[PDB]
């Protein structure tokens, strides 16, 4: 009966994004298509767009996906929480990566300080040797966890370190 969580993750621009609800879609700003692109067969004027750092939210005034009930969105989680990154690949593969969430920490470079949260993959020290870490292009995939019985989404993937153990999620509530 209930909608799979994976079905909320869809391809978008040069990465992916997540239906929080029937009206709300989120992604990483740096993978999105240009301002004024028709998306999901919608014109500009059918939606409003808000962004904090590399977090990007579309709100469609008329629901795009009535089938999908609203999920609690949060601005990160308590540190130490084990969340999952729901990574889809263009091959079709779906990889849920366990990640221990670190501290809310904000850096690309100086004078362009974007905000998010780090975590370490629980996939081990040699995640990229195993084809079990992320790649750029997984950007936009969601980070989620289960608080009690309730599911909640906390951010979207932006990047990983060279040796892929540390990952970075963009956050906010909007």
Author numbering: 1 to 174
What does the paper say about this structure?
Norovirus NS6 is a cysteine protease with a chymotrypsin-like fold: two β-barrel domains separated by a cleft that contains a Cys-His-Asp/Glu catalytic triad similar in arrangement to the Ser-His-Asp triad characteristic of serine proteases. To this end we extended an inactive MNV NS6 construct (which incorporates a C139A mutation to knock out the active site nucleophile) by adding residues from NS7, which is immediately downstream in the polyprotein.
MNV NS6 1′ crystallised in space group C2 with four molecules in the asymmetric unit. This structure is notable for the fact that, in contrast to the other three structures reported here and the structures previously reported for Norwalk virus NS6 protease, the electron density map was of sufficient quality in all four molecules of the asymmetric unit to permit the incorporation of the loop between the β-strands cII and dII. Superposition of the four copies of NS6 1′ indicates some structural variation in this loop—the Cα positions vary by 1–2 Å—consistent with the notion that it is rather flexible. In three of the molecules in the asymmetric unit the C-terminus is disordered beyond residue 173 (chains A and D) or residue 174 (chain C). The C-terminus of Chain B of NS6 1′ beyond Gly 173 extends to make contacts with chain B from an adjacent asymmetric unit to which it is related by a two-fold symmetry axis.
